[PDB]
């Protein structure tokens, strides 16, 4: 390969994840009477990873998420020296998606990124269901770890080949089905950053949480698989 | 093979796509209280491609969509000389499905293709959610491109064999989960043409949009995979 | 094998299909506020076939449906001399499921098989959405044929191995997403017979329709694949 | 392997099953207007098994359920001498998940495990839909058996390799789509025990039912496959 091809793969991948997951949230989740709800948004997120893990996993590894890249580092599956590049690529790709999404959302009368939240992640006063900071920590930490345990397990040498995109993408949908009401569903700092920039207020103030927690969580997940299961 | 067998495969395939996707929209999406919604219609579309990509992909390649055929051309995966045949086959198959659908829908009191839209694609005044022409362009262009990037990636030499119908069909569902509110969900000019003919007014007047945009989009998608990822 | 093992497989399979599909309809579809709707029932039907096609397909072929058995006969994939046995096994298995379902449904105050329809298939006055006999014919005929075209295609020599239960089971879900409002969703005479016996009135009077149409449809589907695609 | 690695795999697996299935029920099922419903909870349960069967099935066998372990024993697929260890591991993992879930749920004003039921399984007066003890028996018994018949079938020597997590996990979703209204959906004594401890009243009093029935059911399922199908 070239590192170029993979960075491009991680960029387009993460663009897809934010464009489709958050796009479904901003455009479709709450459409009157026929809209897709939390379940639909959780399905869309998972499908973005399933579809691009099959399309470009064989190029980059198909992370699309800085907590994945860093957790694969910690699990001994990914070299330290490529981490930063992946993370930049992921972040940039997400930003470009959020931008196009914002443009799309603006073509409907009454749109307002700041007031609606633009699908940004938050806790306490900004949890969709009114959950505390501690509820948000526990849920992003466990779900992050489990996501990474699934990613390690499903790509294990002895895991039957080819199925990983289904396991990994459906694991993200599951995570969505649990967590939207607590944090508006992250486990991914590039996904949180992308839309926080356009929400423009509280989302930027809590954004640090959705860097630290999902990463510590993904590190833990990696360490669990490597030291206890592999 | 014979070119006959494949054209038949592309025809039946596209018939299935319109009969099931648009059929679910016209018959089931809005059924009171128990109807399937946008999420259900997005699932049905994706399943039509998943199921016929597994059934007849090994015959024709399983495009079922003129933007797919033309994007595979641009991506260097499909010969120029078979394009037109595929596109005619796709269009004809879709028309026959729309016709049977119209017959089916007419067996219920109060049906009216023109007033309900017969699941036709539109923008501005005819976007289901009131989105502008520019919102519609950006969304059909990005989603078209991404669809084709997924189709190229998932059928890459190095993509694990056999899984492509799942990636491709679920990618279409994802696209549905995002876009119904903006354009009533196209990325497919045969799907747009099929029902526009029976809607019979505005749908025919905007039909040109849902030829040009999804194609330019599918070309871009192909060019991205070929020049930057493959 | 023994013919015993396969008949048992076809019996348990069809029991599963009726117990889960119709069970989900009678127990869960319309539960206030949280019930699963037409989409949920369509998913359950498809999952019964996906799960038992993986569990016992390698024994019997995994038909679970007299229109499948007879359409595989017509498509040249299944010997005439085993048809009747399969069909009896399928019918018996469905009846035993309907019976247990009726017992389960009766443990809730107010249950009434005859008035609710017990998820029976009907047309005209007994179509859930008020569709005519002709709308019901066209929809059961097309969907039956397509189901059988998918079953033939997905189990073709050149179809990648192992995936057929996913294609076939998801094809049934798709069929459910389209057709519930027209006929309450059949494409399967054992599924129609099972519950008609407990509905006990109109369902028995229209039951003949849901033998003839799905079969003619499944025959057509088989003939299409064999003569035009294979 | 080490028995350690597998017990860890069964523990984390079952933790995932309770954290995600019951978590989705307690956090997301009934969220106003956008919540995921019974269908969403049934999807989440199934996805927990699909995702961890792919991640750790190759280590432990991926049971995550004492009725699975004991039914595989009865079906001649799993040695008597490892049963108890698995069952303890499963139970412990579920308890730790219920505990974290309770902590998470408590960060929202008005939460109350005892009054809401904390997603506990019950019958009669504690069936979500008002079903009798007999309705609950028949449904947990049939669904348990079928679950185990699917698990045996899908992991049969002659079942195509690698697909079992999809069959098994989707079988659990199906089971969820049928049974929530009757028993709040068990077929798993560790899943019932986990949350009963935090519900703290009636759930503990009926907990015995959701040990005995799912086990007798899973034994029957195993015996059916071994003696009649294999
Ligand atoms: C990988 C490159 C992106 C790094 C993520 C940026 C983390 C943002 O951190 C945020 O920014 C502000 C800093 O003054 C604080 O006010 C906020 O409370 C905090 O959320
Ligand atoms: C990779 C890009 C990361 C961007 C992180 C920027 C952190 C923004 O920080 C935010 O700045 C805003 C005004 O400029 C204010 O509304 C907030 O109070 C402040 O926390
Ligand atoms: C990687 C992005 C920054 C992570 C720093 C870890 C510790 C930060 O700690 C937090 O920083 C917040 C934002 O400024 C403060 O508002 C909080 O009081 C503080 O607890
Ligand atoms: C592949 C064969 C089908 C070609 C697609 C036809 C494109 C239709 O183009 C349409 O038709 C009219 C032309 O006068 C215009 O009035 C409409 O505004 C335009 O949508
Ligand atoms: C492959 C078949 C493509 C059919 C495209 C036909 C373009 C139709 O064009 C339409 O004709 C209608 C009346 O005849 C009018 O209602 C519209 O104003 C006009 O744009
Ligand atoms: C392939 C089908 C036609 C594509 C032509 C590309 C440029 C068309 O351009 C458009 O044509 C519309 C329909 O007539 C006009 O109404 C619009 O003003 C015009 O912008
Ligand atoms: C495979 C064995 C089962 C055969 C299916 C039975 C078809 C039932 O046929 C039915 O029965 C009655 C016959 O007098 C008629 O009154 C009904 O209108 C007709 O639906
Ligand atoms: C395999 C079993 C098939 C059973 C088909 C039986 C056909 C029943 O036929 C029905 O009998 C009922 C009363 O007995 C009446 O309500 C109906 O008018 C009559 O059509
Ligand atoms: C396989 C089950 C019977 C199929 C017979 C095919 C032709 C039946 O024909 C139909 O029979 C109905 C039921 O008696 C009558 O009520 C209808 O008038 C008649 O059209
Ligand atoms: C594998 C280790 C856990 C065993 C499961 C415990 C079964 C609980 O059994 C319960 O406990 C009480 C006993 O006095 C009774 O009052 C309850 O009615 C009964 O549900
Ligand atoms: C593996 C752990 C299994 C725990 C099973 C414990 C059985 C509890 O039993 C319950 O005790 C409660 C008060 O302590 C009472 O509310 C109930 O009446 C009683 O049945
Ligand atoms: C494995 C957990 C205990 C299973 C014992 C099987 C028979 C129990 O039997 C039941 O025990 C209940 C709980 O105490 C009583 O309340 C019921 O009356 C009794 O029928």
Number of domains of chain A: 1
Bound molecules: octyl beta-D-glucopyranoside
> And the CATH topology of chain A?
Glycerol uptake facilitator protein
**Total strand segments of chain A:** 0
Oligomer: homotetramer
What radius of gyration of chain A results from the CA coordinates? 16 Å
Beta-strand residue fraction of chain A:
under 5%
CATH class of chain A: Mainly Alpha
Report the biggest beta sheet of chain A as strand number plus sense, adding barrel if it closes. Answer: none
The N- to C-terminal Cα distance of chain A equals 28 Å
Largest interface: A-B, 44 and 49 residues
Please state the overall shape of chain A, judged from the principal axes of the Cα atoms: globular
CATH architecture of chain A: Up-down Bundle
The helix-and-strand class of chain A reads mainly alpha
Identify the CATH homologous superfamily of chain A: Glycerol uptake facilitator protein
Site (Selectivity filter) (chains A, B, C, D): 45, 176, 185, 191
Cytoplasmic side (chains A, B, C, D): 3-10, 57-83, 154-157, 225-230
Subcellular location (chains A, B, C, D): Cell inner membrane
Catalytic activity (chains A, B, C, D): H2O(in) = H2O(out)
């Amino acid at each position: 390969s070239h590192m170029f091809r993979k960075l491009a793969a991680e960029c387009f991948g993460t663009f897809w994840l934010v464009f489709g997951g958050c796009g479904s949230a901003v455009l479709a989740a709450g459409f009157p009477e026929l809209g897709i709800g939390f379940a639909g948004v959780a399905l869309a997120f998972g499908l973005t990873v399933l579809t691009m893990a099959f399309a470009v996993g064989h190029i980059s590894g198909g992370h699309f998420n800085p907590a994945v890249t860093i957790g694969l580092w910690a699990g001994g599956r990914f070299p330290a020296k490529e981490v930063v590049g992946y993370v930049i690529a992921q972040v940039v790709g997400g930003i470009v998606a959020a931008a196009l999404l914002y443009l799309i959302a603006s073509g409907k009368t009454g749109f307002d990124a700041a007031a609606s939240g633009f699908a940004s992640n938050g806790y306490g006063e900004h949890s969709p269901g009114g959950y505390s900071m501690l509820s948000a920590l526990v849920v992003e930490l466990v779900l992050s770890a489990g996501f990474l345990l699934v990613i390690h397990g499903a790509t294990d040498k002895f895991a039957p080949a080819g199925f990983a995109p289904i396991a990994i993408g459906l694991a993200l949908t599951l995570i969505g089905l649990i967590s939207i009401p607590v944090t508006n569903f992250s486990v991914n700092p590039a996904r949180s950053t992308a839309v926080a920039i356009f929400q423009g207020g509280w989302a930027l103030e809590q954004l640090w949480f959705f860097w630290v927690v999902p990463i510590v969580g993904g590190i833990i997940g990696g360490l669990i698989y490597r030291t206890l299961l592999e």
